[PDB]
Symmetry: D3
């Protein structure tokens, strides 16, 4: 292994320069399964990787685990091995009334409600997605006839307080986030997630390309259906990947 | 007038919903000259406005002045008048060695080195351009043929210390901005300009679409300053691109 | 031109060392009109400038435009040409119920609700006016005879949310400024304007003298004058 | 399940009120194996929980994963199931020259170089350990003779720049963290790790007890079983 | 005097390495009179220093005055003279309804609502007490058998606004602290005081052991000093 | 006592509306002596207070103690007691090479290197002094003809690291202040003291007038610790005289 965590060597990537990055390790194989010559690479902690092929071009799929701390390790080490483009796929929950379940969200930039993001660039720096990646995702989404929403996402370091959830053990939410969800809505933020601030800030400030697409599987404001939503989101990302080789 | 600063009424707009917002009032007439039937609407303080037609549709060209404070006023009042899409065209100085004078810059998002953006959203929110507006600018640049770069921009509230210039009266740069240019370069920031941060943040956080394109008229890393003033035809280059891009957003 | 924005040469100042810097370029001639040998020098962007003579000494009148960014440029370039004293004259909205429209206000220091001021000094540093400049202004107010108030001013980067105005396109105000006026009010802040924090901060931390006067055009709870005063104050600092 | 992430029910805990929480799921079983009647409970992502007995009382051993965000989901949800005491066991490096491999570290509180911690308390709130938990750890580390160092730890959201590492793809370290390690060293910080700040801040601000022990396995400026022994021994006296 | 503010020299300490630091100069003597050989060393501004002898070892009691600023002068000039262990004894008011008057509070760490701590470490650094010191104070309160609460303390730079008091000349509290007391209570904060944040932070980041004990003399939601004073003199014996 | 810390009653001010407030409690007496009918009121902790008469009007001299936390208490309780104008007299370390020991520095506004001022207004609010008070202090010094410097002051919550003193136990200063003195120096800041920030802030933000003057006892461009004061105090009194 040439990296301290992933358990991969550059040879395992076979000249790959693009990686699709889901959060959950179990979604790796299912993503790879849609490309050619898919094979397992490695699995260590939340990091399970696979390599496939798209138009004879090596492509890799690697899980990033939950959160920016995890994601920063995966991005950094893949970068070291040779990846230059990162496409994040994942399912999310919307905080906007006009964004319905089954909708597809492509993130232009993210609200930095995380911590790892500051380890790469000051807060004034925008956790913005790469343009090519974003156009690849936006175009792959329409080619499938998906109902898309291209905009701002709020990326939190917590699943609960940071997303203003009160159905918790303490029932309290620190001042900073009190009444925060309604403000994000008023500001047009589409959803909440937990890795895009880091992913987007890391890459945008270190010469790497990154983008993110997600399927909406539940809308806060208001089984097998979610099934198809992830199947289409994954479809969207693999097709966007083809354009970015 | 229906707005306190611009001296404009919705009637003046004739249904327009897109505005091209340069920073110099003197440049408004020139942008409008790339379109059909341009008419001067008004001029008060920093805000000079003209109306033109693009593919038979009403379009507004209005100067914002230097800085986000002045820019926030123009944008705000224009939005009250109906405008929903803002395309900013400007000149800039690149901070990257590979970005040559005469090239065109499209901005995906900006480093918020200003204060007005904070009047619309906390620093955590991204000063990102609208997707459609950026798409139009990138596509139009292709139609025109310019050498284009797409990425991050540093929007500074000052023209001197914020862009780490030392050729000043005091000759000093406050701690925060000491060695900051080298940091932005390292982070891949393309250039410095003074209105995008505010523009992008206030539009993205208020359901308005905004774009930003500029012509590099000088390089902070290069020694020789832009070939006379005719080399500053880059201004005319970026201008055509911003106008072509508006076409696709009508 | 010796500066990139103003379009003025050091000789155009004719040895001037003070400047009245109003916000609106269309008001620059009026002010120069109150002194002697008033001559238009140039007009580029939001910076229109005239030179004049007061007490036999050269004086510059230069518009800054709206906001600290535009002001920071005018002040820097004018300082590059030799100006060492800057007297700002503007309009403003009083936020104290006892301050009436038509009254004049002299700022001692401002609340830094801007950003350009951060390009000259950390937020701990005070955006305070120069003593001799404040005094001249207070003095001139007495001579010209006007309802004057001397105190703290809130300097905002925006005219709408930063001054907590709601009749806007979004009609909303970001958390930071939600209920911020009542607060400034309870802290005895007199008014809302948009250039002092930058003007005052950048001069105070760079060995330049600055003063700030303004005529009230509206009370958030209800020119010839403040101009006469700034001209009068200017003669007291030549 | 009663919780959305760990796949558990209050019933599964058997009344347990204390949990040993390592990072790596793989280490979960080895830890429960040192107790009584260890049984697998669940495994979803990096959250694999086991339930054992220590002197007649049920205790849960649950992995958190890497980082505070991951840690924040397990603590919260474990606390919803009834967990009121948390004990983090781990291995770590060290930025002090007087700490050698095999040494044991007991954190009294930590520097907050994370972000999840700020979702529970303002940065001015101390990411302090619970006194009883810290006592139980020191007494336990003393019972086996492990040379212990009790002090402050630097908890970082990143493994690379946050720990001022330049051996990276960019070989760059943002201004905030440039020259920071030496700073932490001068201030006596013992080591770097990535979940303590989140764990300590969210417990100390929500009526939950927390402690953390770690064995030194590497020294930048220059044992796993011991650590584990010490956390179980300590958990023993806090039931 | 080879120490600018305290007017004390290295010999005035007689080898002392531990110091008890109350905030009131009038409390110094009283504390010092609990041990052998009580001697007055000096008294300048808010700083009145006395020397005592505990179990044959020299001990110092030096007032800090009110606030982190004056406390940082005392701690620094005493450390320059050779002090490494600092024990602050104080009187305080709990903000938790389950804490009664006459109770003893031991501080593990402090919410940094002061400004002098930032002069020793960035806000992220924890205003945490020293383990030894803390254990000693805890054991002493037990040996004395007094009610003891061990936890977090909110250390404020002001006595009124920062502790959210409205019965003042202006009657207004700045946004930052508007509603702040409720927050602290829900977070488990035991009380308010005005020196621990600076003390604890400037000690933990410079290699100096520090502990903090205090007796409850008032409760916002509604023998003590002796108990507090005895515990700290007892605690010092263990840290000797 | 009407207040919790000063041990005074509204009656003890005898109608006083102005209070000269020094830092050292052992200096309140030297200041009261310079006036008519001085009388000692109380001495609790760091707050020793005296009363005097200036031009037939009562005046209070009350020590504030070191730092804004101690000062805020003094100002707050004295204000509660009826004081409305505060003239602070202190000592200070000049950071400019041209300022001489004994020179009198009148402060127009201070850099908030404290923390208590944040308890009254956000950092964006200026720690500025009252125009009348500053005017009186400036003129009174002129009346005497003492070397005077009017300008900005740097007010911190510490005497050592905050004013960038390296000659200490650790010999280091946190990043926040490394190379800070040179900054303030380049920005024209005249000196370092420790209470004006909180004072000027809490007063300017609560409708209380406040002035600030100090005597130079060391020049930081030459040394960290030292080895005319009468002038500074003569000024704060003459100044007070014009504010009654
Ligand atoms: O309810 C309380 C308890 C304590 N303190 C502060 O904590 C100090 C602790 O007492 P001492 O040691 O300074 O006398 C008090 O003087 C005071 O500054 C308060 O402000 N409020």
């Amino acid at each position: 292994s040439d990296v301290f965590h992933l358990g991969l060597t550059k040879n395992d990537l076979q000249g790959a320069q693009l990686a699709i990055v889901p959060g959950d390790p179990e979604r790796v194989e299912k993503i790879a399964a849609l490309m050619d010559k898919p094979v397992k690479l490695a699995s260590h902690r939340e990091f399970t990787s696979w390599r496939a092929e798209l138009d004879g071009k090596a492509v890799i799929v690697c899980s990033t685990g939950i959160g920016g701390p995890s994601t920063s390790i995966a991005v950094e080490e893949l970068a070291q091995l040779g990846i230059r483009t990162f496409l994040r796929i994942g399912t999310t929950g919307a905080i906007q009334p006009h964004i319905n379940v089954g909708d597809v969200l492509v993130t232009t930039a993210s609200v930095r409600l995380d911590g790892a993001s500051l380890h790469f660039a000051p807060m004034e720096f925008p956790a913005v997605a790469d343009f090519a990646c974003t156009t690849a995702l936006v175009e792959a989404a329409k080619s499938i006839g998906a109902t898309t929403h291209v905009g701002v996402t709020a990326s939190s370091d917590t699943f609960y307080p940071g997303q203003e959830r009160y159905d918790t053990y303490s029932g309290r939410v620190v001042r900073r986030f009190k009444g925060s969800m309604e403000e994000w809505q008023a500001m047009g933020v589409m959803n909440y997630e937990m890795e895009s601030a880091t992913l987007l800030t890391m890459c945008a400030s270190q010469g790497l390309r990154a983008g993110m697409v997600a399927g909406v599987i539940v809308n806060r404001t208001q089984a097998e259906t979610m099934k198809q939503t992830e199947s289409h989101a994954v479809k969207i990302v693999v097709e966007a990947a083809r354009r970015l080789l």
